[PDB]
Amino acid sequence: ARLLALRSFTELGARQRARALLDAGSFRELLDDGVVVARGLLDGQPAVLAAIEGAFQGGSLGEVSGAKIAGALELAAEDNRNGVPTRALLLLETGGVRLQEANLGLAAIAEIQAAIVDLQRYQPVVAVIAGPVGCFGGMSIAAGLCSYVLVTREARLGLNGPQVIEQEAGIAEYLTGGEQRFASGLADAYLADDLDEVRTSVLAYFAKGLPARPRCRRAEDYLRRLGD
Amino acid sequence: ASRGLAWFQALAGSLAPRPGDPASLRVADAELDGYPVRFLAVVPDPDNPFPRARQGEVGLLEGWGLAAAVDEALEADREAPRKRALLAIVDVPSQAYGRREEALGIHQALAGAVDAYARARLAGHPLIGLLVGKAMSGAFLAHGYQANRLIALHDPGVMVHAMGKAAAARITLRELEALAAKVPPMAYDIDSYASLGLLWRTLPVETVEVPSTADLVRVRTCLGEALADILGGPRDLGGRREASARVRRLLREQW
């Protein structure tokens, strides 16, 4: 039990990750498609967890999977307006949308993004990107909205995947790993691939509450720095 | 340079960017039906400091630039009796693709734009997205898709999708227009998109590339009615698909 194979977070499927992070005995899966939505407690506090199964369709989002995430976030915001401090935790292993439902998937991402901003008037959303799929596409923009972004060494986070970059921008020009993101200030914590460590970081960040000056509110500063 | 630029000039009255803005951004304050509005458009800038963003893409400067321009309006109207409308004129080919863009966090820049637009909407600014051309992928998420109401021109050049036709062809090893045409959420045309229930209205125009006087009148009228329809009402996304509805009903039952 002290060995990596039994302590690893990335080795777990999405449903196992969700069960492992929520307080013992609180895990309750809704709508039991490729996304797990679960209710539970996080250190005794009401919580909802959406976890994308990257092993299925590469975690590509469609109409149903997209609505599951958006709807979970929407109900958490509703809870908070009713005085219930529900916290949302997003496990983002995804590469984009399903071509066959492309515009429904994209519309759902816009709804997910809207719900994150609404909810973060009350509670921070924590996003965990652990790999092995990592987080690409429209959902990386969602990650960029979240109060806190936690990554592992095996995580990648970015807008465009490797293949679409090379096909559009070329084999080379004249980056997305968890360590790099942390070093450039685009992720808030760099985590060992260890279940207990991931769980504790998640709880510490929720207990921290809403950040005073998150990255999204620093446009003038980013514009200055890019201007350099 | 683009349909977005053409329509910005027609609707706002000016062509040149503001002193403080990236040249790939057009921003102008004006009035519609006596109501304060701000027009925003992303447009091509061949002299973009970022080489991968020189053909109208939403890249680093465009994402953070939009965030800044929207937040500027939000802060200015904090005390005003009337929050100015944000009129997004949408004609964007894609997000920028590049290694410098990824290294410098283009996903975060576009998140900045989304966050500003959403906060403005939640605070009571009417947001209207006017689709006059391409509305693609992350560029559309950043510029337009947070609108209270979406209005599209009914024209073959107006396309909403998650990826380019070329990219889609590569992944399905292909011809793709033919395949995508039978699957509405997969289709690129605006009639298919409208069938999803995601547009408030569609509008035919005579000369889509440079609006006629009658076109300008029809579009201004429609924007006016969208504005009237939003004001005082709920501040949700316009889209607010039976499967989606079922999902939300089940979540509420089981919450």
Author numbering:
A (entry chain B): 5 to 36, 57 to 198, 209 to 262
B (entry chain A): 6 to 179, 183 to 248, 254 to 268
Task: Reproduce text from the manuscript describing this model.
Pseudomonas species and other aerobic bacteria have a biotin-independent malonate decarboxylase that is crucial for their utilization of malonate as the sole carbon and energy source. MdcA, MdcC, MdcD, and MdcE form the 140 kD MDC holoenzyme, with 1:1:1:1 stoichiometry among the four subunits. The malonyl-ACP is decarboxylated in the second step of the reaction to regenerate acetyl-ACP, which is catalyzed by MdcD (30 kD) and MdcE (28 kD).
We determined the crystal structure of the P. aeruginosa MdcD–MdcE complex at 1.86 Å resolution by the selenomethionyl single-wavelength anomalous diffraction method. The two copies of the MdcD–MdcE complex in the asymmetric unit have essentially the same conformation, with overall rms distance of 0.4 Å between their equivalent Cα atoms. The structures of the MdcD and MdcE subunits have the crotonase fold, with a β–β–α motif that is repeated four times in its core (β–β–α superhelix). The two subunits are related by a rotation of 173° in this complex, suggesting pseudo two-fold symmetry between them. The A. calcoaceticus MdcD–MdcE complex was reported to be a 2:2 hetero-tetramer in solution, and the MdcD subunit itself could also dimerize. In contrast, the P. aeruginosa MdcD–MdcE complex is a 1:1 hetero-dimer in solution based on our gel filtration data, and a 2:2 hetero-tetramer was not observed in the crystal either. The structural overlay with the S. aureus CT indicates that the C-terminal helices (α8A and α8B) of MdcD clash with the second copy of the S. aureus CT and therefore the MdcD–MdcE complex is incompatible with the CT hetero-tetramer, which may explain why Pseudomonas MdcD–MdcE is a 1:1 complex. In fact, this helix and the following residues are mostly disordered in the malonate complex and MdcD–MdcE alone.
